[PDB]
Amino acid sequence: ALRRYPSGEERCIACKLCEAVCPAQAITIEAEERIDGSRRTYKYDIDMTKCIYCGYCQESCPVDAIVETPNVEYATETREELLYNKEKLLANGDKWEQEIQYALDADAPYR
Amino acid sequence: VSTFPLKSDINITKSGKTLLSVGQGGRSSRTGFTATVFGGTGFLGRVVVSKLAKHGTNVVVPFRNDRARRQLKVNGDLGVVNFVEFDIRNLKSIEDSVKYSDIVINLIGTEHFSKNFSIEDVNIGAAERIAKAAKEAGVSRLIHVSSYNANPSSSSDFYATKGIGEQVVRDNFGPDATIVRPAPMYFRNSPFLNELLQIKALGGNVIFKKEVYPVHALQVGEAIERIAFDDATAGQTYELFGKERYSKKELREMIKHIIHIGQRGYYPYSAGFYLPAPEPFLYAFALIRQYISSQPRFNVDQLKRSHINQEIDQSAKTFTDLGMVPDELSEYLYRYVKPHISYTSQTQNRTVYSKEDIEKLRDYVNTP
Amino acid sequence: TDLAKELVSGAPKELITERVARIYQEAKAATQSGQHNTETWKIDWDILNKGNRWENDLMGYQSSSDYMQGTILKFDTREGAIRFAKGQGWDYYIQEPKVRRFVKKDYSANFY
Amino acid sequence: KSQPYDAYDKVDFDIAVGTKGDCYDRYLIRMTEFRQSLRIIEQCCNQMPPGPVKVEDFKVAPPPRALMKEDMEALIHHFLLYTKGYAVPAGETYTAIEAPKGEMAVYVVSDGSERPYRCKIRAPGFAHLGAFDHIARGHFLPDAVAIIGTMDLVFGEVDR
Amino acid sequence: SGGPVPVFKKYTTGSKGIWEKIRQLLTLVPNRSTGNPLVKNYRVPPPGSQTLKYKDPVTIPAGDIVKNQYYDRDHRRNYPRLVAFDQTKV
Amino acid sequence: YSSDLPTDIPVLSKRPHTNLLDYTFTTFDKMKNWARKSSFWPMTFGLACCAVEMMHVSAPRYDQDRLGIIFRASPRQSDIMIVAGTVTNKMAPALRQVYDQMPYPRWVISMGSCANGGGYYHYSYSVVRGVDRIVPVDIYVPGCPPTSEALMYGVFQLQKKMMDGQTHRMWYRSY
Amino acid sequence: TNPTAFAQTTRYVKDSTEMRTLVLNLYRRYLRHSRGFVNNYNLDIPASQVRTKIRQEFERQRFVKDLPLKNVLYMKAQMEFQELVNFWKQQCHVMQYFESIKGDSFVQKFLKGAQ
Amino acid sequence: STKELTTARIKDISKPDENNLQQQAPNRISPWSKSQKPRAEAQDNVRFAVKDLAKQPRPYAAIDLIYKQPIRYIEHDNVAVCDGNGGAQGHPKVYINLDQNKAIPCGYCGLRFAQAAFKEDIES
Amino acid sequence: SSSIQRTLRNLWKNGFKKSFKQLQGYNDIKSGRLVGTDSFGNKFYEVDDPVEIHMRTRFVEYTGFWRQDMSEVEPGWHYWLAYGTDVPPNQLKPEEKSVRAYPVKKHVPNLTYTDGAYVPYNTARPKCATWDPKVTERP
Ligand SMILES: NC(=O)C1=CN([C@@H]2O[C@H](COP(=O)(O)OP(=O)(O)OC[C@H]3O[C@@H](n4cnc5c(N)ncnc54)[C@H](OP(=O)(O)O)[C@@H]3O)[C@@H](O)[C@H]2O)C=CC1
Ligand SMILES: CCCCCCCCCCCC(=O)OC[C@H](COP(=O)(O)OCC[N+](C)(C)C)OC(=O)CCCCCCCCCCC
Ligand code: SF4
Ligand code: SF4
Ligand code: SF4
Ligand SMILES: [Zn+2]
């Protein structure tokens, strides 16, 4: 999931750390200057059929933008549904924000 | 198939769209075309869907059987093959299948009538509705597959409805509709060969006397690939047939020797490989099973068609107009009847029938 | 040297009759003052004129058909790179590295 | 015991040794190793010391996240460890550990870069299965199933 | 030495009252545990509800702000050199 | 030869039950769908680490047998094919043959990143990039490996799909 | 450890004349097993076409002159022979082996994209 | 008008409709990047033919939410310090100069900081 | 835990209607103290019975009677059910809650096997723009 700041702004600054670390090369990122001048991405894809669910992207994120929810019940009928774009990842972040906050408040001190 | 089906990487449709192909022509490549294959879960449909999707062309497959459509998706990459649950009695479902399509191939047709559909409804009503819906969606190309003996004045319901289907399609979609008249097609699990391979073929003296010009099913699907991507084929009629004429009795006896049913002299007669019955009895049995059996059996109309041989319309076009040489049944006969061989199992030596071996076997069959 | 080792390597014939490899020494990046990457000789293949990269319409992925697009061999000497390219029967060409001319540089020259 | 590693020299345990060299002896050894491992686990719980769990070297080990967001040098090391990695001095090694399957070893070749030049993985199951022909000859079919089980074969390890 | 341990000293759910007396009579080895973790002891504070306040542990010689020159502990760049002895040097 | 096709007859998945025969064949489908959903027999086809999580579904903690799930060693006696592991090019012909030997009705489950799209070995010279290149997949289970509950959730999704089958009502209304 | 069926001990032949005999001996073994290849893999072609295919593959290396290359070529041919006779190959591989098939003009490649 | 639905703009010339599925976001009509594909064009694909557009993921546009946050005005200091208002769970701490007579946003959060002496100039 | 006396106690506490619903999906008759409800409508309970085993002290009562879906559990209570914390989301401190600047809607479960399934698409424009043709007449 892709997370937001409490003000609603996206946490990711399109720094492309997660794309470089990813052992399976499951992350595709395209970025540019936003309309207002912010450093933001306009394309953030994760191939869930290619990811090995290893957490390197979460560890490398400097702003905690990309995280892994404790969710596992999202099996899909078609393989296309496992190709997450930015809209799917941002929606997941909004949907699972409360549960992610549970994990962060207990695991952040150990990081 | 080959490695790249299109003759050029840029194609302009009849509706004005410019389509650019990307890639060398593999699974990950694209042709820029989106096609709808009505009846893509049928015998010919699977061949057509496999050829279109293997080169990257987007295929929309309307379907009514949920389990039958699953094997079609393997042909193409992710997002290439799409499915729409449809019924010819649902106008909205048909209009959704052709909304994004540049090519519409109508493979819907039947030789039987059921409790829900008649021969007219599928061969004429379904074709007309698909053709008219395609034009209102601005589809550049429409391909309709009629039968080999399509004739609106024919005494057979199947041939007459196919003949009317050709005319009703051209009126609705327009002069830009291409019509294909394929001969009986031979292939793995082919209906033309399944009847011949059936051990207990009731009334073989009345049914297996029909003479046809069998054509390879892989070539028919290949021909449709040529027609769809070549705008020079619009508005034409294609008769797809083999060079060599065959009678079903010759094929039946030739197959009997390949299967080695005759290894035991008594067995073919005892097992019921010959079931001579009077035609009036076959008519009665076909009439009864039209309302008792829940599965499509040999019906009344097919009994009429046993007396009608395949006649070729000379004015129509052939494989030569598409730059192809028809495959010979003698070359491919062994590989398509091989699964039905009794024992084989590399016991002593497999008897592989080549092109010359099949032709010699034909002489033996006709030798008294 | 003269042995045609490509007959036993197992690589497809297209590597010989259709692809061109470049033997080169990496040039120093204009954004950095390091020269470590310029100490080794490398071999890569010229891109295919068609099908090197195309956009997958489903997700915008960079699709390709060039199987040598991501292969870069490393050599310690120029002679070793030539000997290996000749051994495999590859069609290649050498890009001679540019050498920087030496000019004396002293602080006194800021005024004289 | 032959080449102690990772605090195995600070715990007390015994090794079971068979005599007949058949499957039953190997079953008994693996049951003793069950209890000896439980013996070691108890000592590790009691003797767990305080201190860092990774090397205090931010050029190899990632810095803590809290220190990353406050220290300039921590951010640089965090950035470079995840984008370029850490370079390893040129050379080669053959490191082996007493894996549960047997002797598992890796032959890693370093070229001074951040990516291994060669990584040969030695699988005890790969060597065990190579002796299956020499061991299972003359036995019956159900004995082969026992011999396969007694070798503790995982084919990801074999086919790495 | 890891000798036999009574059942009540093991962190598993056991029997009570008459059902404990019956278990001792019928079981061949009465001191064995049932293997069901204690609901009131095992994982009762979940990892997400721990009250411990974690702090990063740092050693003094290598993690202090003074007397902590990095090259004094730069073992990676002080690796042993690779030396090969041929028949000439031997 | 006049054909008058109705235009607004809903498709089978939307078609309500109007006459008495609709409830008859829907009862026929539900009796079969319940039987196949309840008698969920996968085939023992463990390939790689994904199989370990598949074993823990049969473990006492989850006890797949409580739902009627029994693993069969022969394709003849199994109707569910769970591809749990990496499919290699050397293995792909064997996987296709085993799949073809399963009598109908049959379903295929793709578990783990290897079977879904290749996962860690996507760019390998000897790995198939997704089992769907060989056999049709009915449900994809994500994870590396998917947890024992992740696999059970995928099975529940498939059983939900199976209970919605209308094989015998399709013959009555669609054919 | 006993070697599998039809397994030969790898050897480096230092005589060109001896190498020619070994190739001829292996060439006849391929021809003798042509019918076995048809039976085991259930091919759609007669054994006569298999022998033509075997001859064509052998003729592709007829004019190889370097002796070290001959030893590798002979060794791999022995491995291929062992693979086919022992039915280690799947039937799909052998079918595709015999499923191997005037080039296009400059304009024909140009109009479609070429390579 | 399909011109506001397919062109990147700093502001939407009209009020966004939360029930309109052709907007880029429920709270924003136009896209906010020159390379961002318009949602209306993206949904005009063969794969959306029989798909309900309402249930598709439509997260709110972050560009419209961040500018609803009031400007933070700093008293008796020309430097603003921001770390995400979360500390260890925020972003790396950075220092923003406020000498210029305008609001300057954070490099990570996008929160805008300025001096109180420039409050009148900025608001007008 | 598998005793018939435990079932009889839960049968009495729950009643006929509650227990029969458990006899249709749960394959077990269980009773517990209500902890809260999610936006989708599911009810969550905690069991104080000493005879319950380690991993069976928390359970959900789904809204449906014939079919149950794990994805219908709200993300707020999904973590609590899996024993990730001892504080249910309805017992959360105001500072421990998530702050959303966007509105919140009803929980939406997994949408597979429906018409609402997620359809992937490219969020980026084509990297090259073709020339818009124009005609200028020569003098
Ligand atoms: N030897 C041959 O097979 C010959 C073929 N033809 C014609 O070629 C065309 C292709 O048929 P073929 O593949 O060969 O064999 P089939 O007769 O099995 O193909 C029939 C196709 O049309 C569909 N169909 C029939 N009725 C309906 C209906 N009411 N509603 C929706 N779909 C329907 C079927 O869908 P579904 O499977 O889901 O029921 C199927 O896909 C046919 O029109 C046939 O008449 C003519 C001469 C020779
Ligand atoms: C004679 C041969 C041997 C016996 C075989 C018996 C097999 C067991 C039956 C299958 C069970 C099954 O399928 O019931 C499961 C289904 C649920 O179906 P669903 O898809 O989960 O929901 C879809 C259904 N809605 C939409 C309604 C939710 O329950 C039912 O609808 C039960 C209600 C029907 C009426 C029940 C009482 C009528 C009397 C029935 C007894 C005479
Ligand atoms: S968790 Fe998945 S996406 Fe993230 S770095 Fe690991 S493999 Fe890549
Ligand atoms: S690591 Fe975090 S901030 Fe950097 S690109 Fe990935 S998600 Fe964005
Ligand atoms: S997906 Fe992951 S867990 Fe499953 S087989 Fe592949 S590597 Fe193993
Ligand atoms: Zn900030």
Side-chain angles (χ1 to χ4, degrees), chain A residues 21 58-62 64 111, chain D residues 64-65 69 78-79 82-83:
Chain A
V21 194
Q58 186 180 18
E59 301 169 15
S60 62
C61 193
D64 308 0
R111 303 174 188 266
Chain D
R65 274 187 157 274
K69 300 177 183 179
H78 172 92
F79 187 94
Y82 283 103
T83 58

Side-chain angles (χ1 to χ4, degrees), chain B residues 9 22-24 28-30 78, chain C residues 50-51 54 56-58 65:
Chain B
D9 51 359
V22 293
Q24 304 291 348
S28 300
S29 302
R30 298 293 182 268
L78 292 179
Chain C
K50 188 180 183 61
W54 72 86
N56 172 257
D57 54 356
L58 182 57
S65 60

Side-chain angles (χ1 to χ4, degrees), chain D residues 49-70:
Chain D
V53 299
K54 58 181 64 65
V55 293
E56 290 187 342
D57 195 333
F58 288 165
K59 306 182 184 297
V60 178
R65 274 187 157 274
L67 189 61
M68 172 196 64
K69 300 177 183 179
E70 203 275 344

Side-chain angles (χ1 to χ4, degrees), chain B residues 99-237:
Chain B
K99 179 178 179 60
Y100 300 89
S101 300
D102 311 320
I103 309 173
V104 175
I105 303 174
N106 185 24
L107 304 173
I108 296 184
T110 183
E111 306 175 2
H112 320 263
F113 63 96
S114 62
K115 59 192 174 306
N116 305 121
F117 306 100
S118 63
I119 308 181
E120 305 83 298
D121 295 8
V122 177
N123 296 17
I124 301 177
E128 172 185 346
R129 177 170 292 179
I130 294 174
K132 194 175 72 67
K135 184 171 187 171
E136 304 184 35
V139 178
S140 60
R141 293 292 310 278
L142 176 74
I143 303 181
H144 178 78
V145 168
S146 57
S147 63
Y148 47 91
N149 271 338
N151 183 18
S153 59
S154 179
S155 58
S156 176
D157 295 320
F158 180 69
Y159 294 156
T161 49
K162 285 290 185 178
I164 303 180
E166 296 186 358
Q167 297 174 337
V168 71
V169 161
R170 291 192 175 275
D171 294 0
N172 284 261
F173 185 78
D176 305 68
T178 306
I179 302 180
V180 179
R181 299 209 187 105
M185 294 176 292
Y186 61 89
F187 189 53
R188 285 298 314 276
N189 195 32
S190 178
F192 169 69
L193 288 184
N194 287 335
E195 50 167 354
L196 308 178
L197 293 162
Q198 192 173 12
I199 297 299
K200 299 176 181 59
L202 182 58
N205 59 332
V206 184
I207 305 173
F208 292 154
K209 74 183 191 65
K210 184 188 184 69
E211 306 213 29
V212 291
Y213 294 83
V215 63
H216 197 182
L218 290 178
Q219 246 184 335
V220 176
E222 180 187 10
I224 298 181
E225 185 183 24
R226 302 285 201 87
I227 294 177
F229 295 137
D230 187 12
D231 295 328
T233 66
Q236 311 300 319
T237 294

Side-chain angles (χ1 to χ4, degrees), chain B residues 334 338 352, chain G residues 37-38 41-45 50 94-95 98:
Chain B
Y334 172 76
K338 185 173 60 180
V352 192
Chain G
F37 296 154
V38 177
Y41 300 103
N42 190 23
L43 301 186
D44 295 350
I45 63 174
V50 177
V94 181
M95 289 295 297
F98 290 99

Side-chain angles (χ1 to χ4, degrees), chain A residues 62, chain D residues 63 67-68 71-80, chain H residues 92 108:
Chain D
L67 189 61
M68 172 196 64
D71 187 14
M72 181 72 254
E73 305 198 13
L75 186 67
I76 295 181
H77 286 62
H78 172 92
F79 187 94
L80 295 175
Chain H
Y108 298 85

